[PDB]
């Protein structure tokens, strides 16, 4: 017999399935003998100590900045002073160097939130002695010569001696649940084009510059013995907190600046000597 | 001080922190590039986006998209020098004709090429097409569907594929030179027509050998106003 | 996993020879040295066979076997005085061949497996190196009859870098010394051949 098929349904045809998404469904055709066969990760697989998320990379300690602390530095003097924004290192000049893991990875997202961790390693010996005060300052900033303004905020005083390192969690205290990135979402300028106001007027967005600052001031002046160095370097490490968050994938603000060469056809393009 | 509470889940449940999830969303490679039937076909080397495909102001003009190096997943792949598993290539032919456009997979042969190429420098390939040599092939029929998504396997000798080198144009040991790819994907038309190509990681895909962040530069500040005019 | 497939014949260990401590060349750190400067670097195993400690009994099995898998352990001993100060970092980069000149800063070192040495306290540091290579085995030695298509004797690179410059007191010493020591925790050899001189 050849009976008629009365079953039918209305459909909406799409060219690709799950094209925008990173997960869900896919209509990909395997270029294999067996269409459901996959790569084996029985022996060769990802090592357990490797980072699985962007947040895992942000939890790696990275050397942000350095500063010197000497016996000549009078009390109340700013040894360190920066806007701590993981979006951009500077708002008013170009950057070139080794950016920290958490800054690199934060540069891929339009939004960030949660506390930021700092670690101050004093490159000294047992004969160095002194005290500094680390301060997290929000909304309103302190004068360079007014130590009292810094003391009125969220502070941690460290007595340098036998211990040569101190940890500092910078609280997240803002008017919004997340902060948008100060870097651009999309920048088509590739050939260092000389900027004008019309270029800026037709930008992707407006840079919401942070006024949140972390400072280090002298409490007790450094008083080392005559036999050792009078000045020491302090290494400032940075990473995302345990509840550091990222969202809204965008164009990367940072890109390789060293040993960048585009691929060519091997061996057609003059490889045969 | 307090660790506080995470913002993850507050705005939405669409988490975008997973490395695999970032690598599985597509990257444009070629934007409206020509296919010519005088050649064997347009070669696409099977490798993820990275610093290997980064444009530098001044260097010779390629067919590649300039902003591949600035994509999230390219920045991620610059941290991992090993990758294993399948990649997925979304190819769109700019046509509505009934001519079939064939996409042939070549396994790891040891070379590394891209763009239009005459294999063994002949001047005729209609009688000896690459898609009818024996290799695995799939056809696009633009009248039906101008797009396709094909998943290429990890057909190589090595445990891992090498993501990048310090210099991509350096003439070193020839067997090692080809270990940055796991094969090729060759598109062959009937008549002259344009195409666009995207790439992403497959479901069966892993990265390893973490290298940490490289030396970088930015000038994003300069092309934007602040919130105080 | 890959060991049993890659080699049809069984692999061999020589713990008595390979799993002993062996010192290599001395490293000099001066006050002139800046942050990010390479004090020393080692392509392994190559440099432990044919440059450093060439007459070591650790190197004897490499003469006869063509392939192997290698897990190492490297101890570093510093000797600066209590009136000096400074920081040195030692890190490992797996499968570094034609990628030594990138991701090669102090920041990359802090990301990868590493150890940190304070030059005043003289704390010892021990970095553990597993075998992470894109092939099943690494080749031990080059030869005239052997192919030049595969560059042998390099599955990883070790970097010794200045993190914070050496400083000293008035009329103090302008330098101090660090000594590395190496040993194989797991050296499996494969593919027996006639004995040859190393490089």
């Amino acid at each position: 017999d050849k009976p008629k098929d009365v079953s039918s349904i209305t459909i909406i045809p799409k060219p690709r399935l799950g094209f925008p998404h990173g997960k869900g469904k896919s209509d990909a055709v395997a270029m294999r003998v067996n269409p459901v066969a996959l790569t084996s990760f029985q022996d060769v697989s990802a090592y357990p100590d490797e980072p699985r998320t962007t947040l895992d990379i942000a939890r790696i300690w990275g050397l942000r900045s350095t500063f010197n602390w000497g016996s000549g530095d009078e009390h109340g003097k700013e040894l360190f002073n920066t806007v701590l924004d993981p979006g951009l290192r500077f708002y008013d000049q170009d950057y070139e160097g080794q950016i920290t893991p958490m800054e690199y990875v934060t540069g891929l997202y339009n939004f960030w939130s949660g506390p930021i961790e700092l670690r101050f390693d004093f490159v000294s010996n047992a004969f160095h002695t002194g005290t500094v005060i680390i301060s997290a300052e929000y909304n309103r900033s302190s004068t360079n010569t007014d130590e009292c303004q810094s003391h009125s905020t969220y502070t941690k005083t460290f007595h340098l001696g036998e211990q040569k390192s101190v940890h500092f969690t910078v609280p997240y205290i803002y008017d919004t649940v997340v902060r948008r990135n100060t870097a651009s979402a999309y920048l088509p300028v590739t050939d260092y084009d000389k900027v004008d106001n019309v270029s800026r007027a037709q930008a992707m967005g407006i840079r919401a510059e942070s006024k949140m600052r972390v400072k280090v001031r002298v409490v007790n002046v450094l008083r080392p013995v005559a036999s050792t160095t009078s000045t020491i370097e302090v290494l400032v490490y940075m990473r995302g907190g345990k509840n550091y968050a990222l969202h809204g994938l965008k164009q990367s603000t940072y890109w390789p600046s060293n040993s960048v060469v585009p691929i060519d056809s091997f061996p057609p393009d003059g490889y045969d000597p | 001080f307090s660790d506080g509470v995470t913002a993850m889940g507050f705005q939405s449940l669409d988490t975008q922190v997973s490395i695999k999830d970032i690598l599985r969303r597509p990257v444009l490679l070629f934007n409206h590039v020509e296919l010519d039937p005088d050649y064997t076909g347009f070669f696409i080397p099977i490798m993820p986006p990275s610093r290997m495909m980064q444009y530098k102001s001044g260097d010779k003009e390629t067919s590649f998209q300039r902003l591949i190096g600035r994509t999230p997943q390219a920045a991620i792949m610059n941290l991992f020098r090993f990758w294993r598993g399948s990649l997925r290539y979304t190819i769109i032919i700019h046509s509505t004709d009934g001519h079939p456009i064939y996409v042939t997979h070549v396994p790891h042969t040891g070379n590394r090429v891209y763009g239009l190429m005459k294999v063994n420098n002949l001047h005729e390939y209609t009688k000896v097409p690459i898609f009818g040599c024996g290799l695995t092939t799939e056809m696009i029929i633009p009248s039906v569907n101008p797009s396709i998504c094909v998943e290429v396997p990890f057909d190589t000798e090595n445990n891992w594929a090498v993501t990048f080198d310090e210099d991509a144009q350096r003439n070193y040991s020839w067997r090692d030179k080809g270990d940055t790819v796991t094969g090729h994907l060759v598109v062959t038309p009937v008549v002259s027509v344009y195409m666009s190509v995207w790439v992403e990681a497959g479901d069966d895909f892993e990265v390893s050998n973490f290298y940490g962040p490289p030396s970088v530069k930015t000038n994003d500040w300069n092309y934007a106003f602040s919130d105080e005019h | 996993g890959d060991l049993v497939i890659a080699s049809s014949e069984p692999t061999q260990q020589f713990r008595s020879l390979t799993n002993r401590w062996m010192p290599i060349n001395s490293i000099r750190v001066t006050v002139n040295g800046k942050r990010n400067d390479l004090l020393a670097q080692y392509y392994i195993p190559e440099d432990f066979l044919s440059t450093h400690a060439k007459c070591a009994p650790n190197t004897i099995p490499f003469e006869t076997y063509v392939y192997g898998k290698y897990e190492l352990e490297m101890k570093f001993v510093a000797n600066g005085n209590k009136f000096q100060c400074g920081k040195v970092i030692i890190s490992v980069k797996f499968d570094s061949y034609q990628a030594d000149n990138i991701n090669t800063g102090f920041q990359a070192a802090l990301s990868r497996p590493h150890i940190m040495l304070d030059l005043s306290t003289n704390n010892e540091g021990v970095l553990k190196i597993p075998f992470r290579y894109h092939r099943a085995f690494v080749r031990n030695q080059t030869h005239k009859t052997a192919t030049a298509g595969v560059r042998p004797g390099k599955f990883a690179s070790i970097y010794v870098q200045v993190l914070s410059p050496l400083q000293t007191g008035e009329g103090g010493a302008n330098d101090m010394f660090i000594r590395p020591f190496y040993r194989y925790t797991r050296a499996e050899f494969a593919g027996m051949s006639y004995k040859v001189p190393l490089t």
């Binding site: 003059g270 000597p273 | 210099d167 144009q169 350096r170 003439n171 070193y172 040991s173 | 990010n36 400067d37 390479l38 004090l39 020393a40 670097q41 080692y42 392509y43 440099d47 440059t51 061949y97 034609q98 030594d100 000149n101 090669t104 800063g105 560059r151």
Partner: peptide
């Protein structure tokens, strides 16, 4: 014309020498 490095800083295999520390 950068197809290979100069002979001062290289080990036969046309790569940076382990002796040449100033590469960084």
């Amino acid at each position: 014309p950068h197809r290979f490095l100069p002979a001062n800083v290289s080990n036969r295999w046309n790569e940076y020498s382990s002796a040449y520390l100033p590469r960084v």
